[PDB]
Amino acid sequence: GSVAIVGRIILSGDTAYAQQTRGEEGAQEVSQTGRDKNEAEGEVQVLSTATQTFLGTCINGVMWTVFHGAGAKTLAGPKGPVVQMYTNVDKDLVGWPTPPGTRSLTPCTCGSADLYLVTRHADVVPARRRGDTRASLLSPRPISYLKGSSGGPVMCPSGHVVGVFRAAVCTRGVAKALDFIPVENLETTMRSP
Ligand SMILES: CC(C)(C)[C@@H]1NC(=O)O[C@@H]2CCC[C@H]2OC/C=C/C(F)(F)c2nc3ccccc3nc2O[C@@H]2C[C@@H](C(=O)N[C@]3(C(=O)NS(=O)(=O)C4(C)CC4)C[C@H]3C(F)F)N(C2)C1=O
Ligand SMILES: [Cl-]
Ligand SMILES: [Zn+2]
């Protein structure tokens, strides 16, 4: 089974919109055959396997997502399934060559502490950065609000990408903070010998 693109999260600065591109049947077919003839576009994709769904974020020519969503699976593409370029279980990180037609977000170099997560439902969730990999939510959220958004982007006010959403700091079913793979750690992954 392959990972399939089933939609994209269109970013328009302050707001986002979730556009579905595959229904359940089409999604399953793309994952089964590993072949996807739709011309992809955008920077944030909605991804699905046979059993799960989550997000992927295009950065530095690679579409990144979480290992706990994609495993080591191939990505369905126009020429057939595409093997993962990066697979790091320790970081819960995987990457494929960015699908043709997509574009990459720019890594943030402005150091702003005011961040926002874009969820799979196109919700924008403000957060305040707390160290390298964490950001505290301005408003607590039920975990169901954030489920399915692993692999989505954490952004700065200028529309730069700061990190890739990995996990929620969550007790008693309420998320208080975000854990994300910082963009600098993606560059390290692309530099690791
Ligand atoms: C309690 C909780 C919120 C469920 C949990 N918090 C939590 O563990 O907090 C601690 C303390 C602060 C950071 C974190 O340190 C531990 C690191 C965990 C990890 F992430 F690195 C991780 N590495 C793995 C590597 C290999 C195999 C499996 C792995 N499994 C992992 O974590 C698991 C999964 C991850 C998850 O749910 N991610 C999200 C999501 O949407 N997934 S998903 O799309 O629906 C779906 C399941 C389809 C793919 C974004 C959060 C959303 F729900 F908000 N988890 C549990 C959590 O977030
Ligand atoms: Cl990391
Ligand atoms: Zn920035």
Side-chain angles (χ1 to χ4, degrees), residues 1-36 38-193:
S2 290
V3 175
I5 298 167
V6 302
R8 60 185 149 261
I9 304 301
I10 306 174
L11 307 177
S12 297
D14 203 55
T15 165
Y17 183 80
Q19 175 188 352
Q20 179 176 301
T21 58
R22 297 283 196 177
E24 186 55 34
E25 313 306 317
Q28 295 291 352
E29 178 177 2
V30 173
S31 284
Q32 288 175 343
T33 63
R35 187 173 296 274
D36 181 0
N38 286 350
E39 305 182 356
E41 50 186 330
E43 307 98 341
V44 180
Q45 312 297 316
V46 187
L47 308 174
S48 293
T49 66
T51 58
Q52 307 239 67
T53 178
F54 45 95
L55 300 177
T57 302
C58 303
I59 317 174
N60 293 337
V62 176
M63 181 169 63
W64 307 93
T65 189
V66 289
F67 181 84
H68 79 258
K73 290 176 184 282
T74 54
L75 172 73
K79 310 194 238 84
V82 183
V83 299
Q84 289 184 3
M85 202 173 160
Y86 301 99
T87 309
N88 187 335
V89 174
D90 289 337
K91 284 181 187 166
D92 194 16
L93 179 68
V94 308
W96 306 271
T98 201
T102 59
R103 58 182 294 182
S104 293
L105 296 166
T106 303
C108 177
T109 67
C110 75
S112 174
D114 300 317
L115 311 174
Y116 62 91
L117 167 75
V118 186
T119 75
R120 70 174 295 107
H121 310 293
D123 291 316
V124 177
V125 184
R128 184 78 176 182
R129 186 153 194 176
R130 298 274 182 265
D132 281 359
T133 68
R134 300 284 178 86
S136 49
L137 295 177
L138 304 195
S139 302
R141 310 294 183 125
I143 187 62
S144 56
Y145 195 73
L146 303 180
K147 271 285 168 181
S149 291
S150 66
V154 181
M155 314 281 299
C156 83
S158 296
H160 312 142
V161 66
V162 170
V164 176
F165 187 33
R166 176 172 47 202
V169 182
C170 162
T171 55
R172 297 180 307 273
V174 175
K176 292 98 172 156
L178 307 174
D179 177 77
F180 55 87
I181 301 133
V183 65
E184 292 82 6
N185 289 10
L186 308 181
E187 208 197 347
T188 300
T189 294
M190 301 186 72
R191 282 184 70 97
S192 284

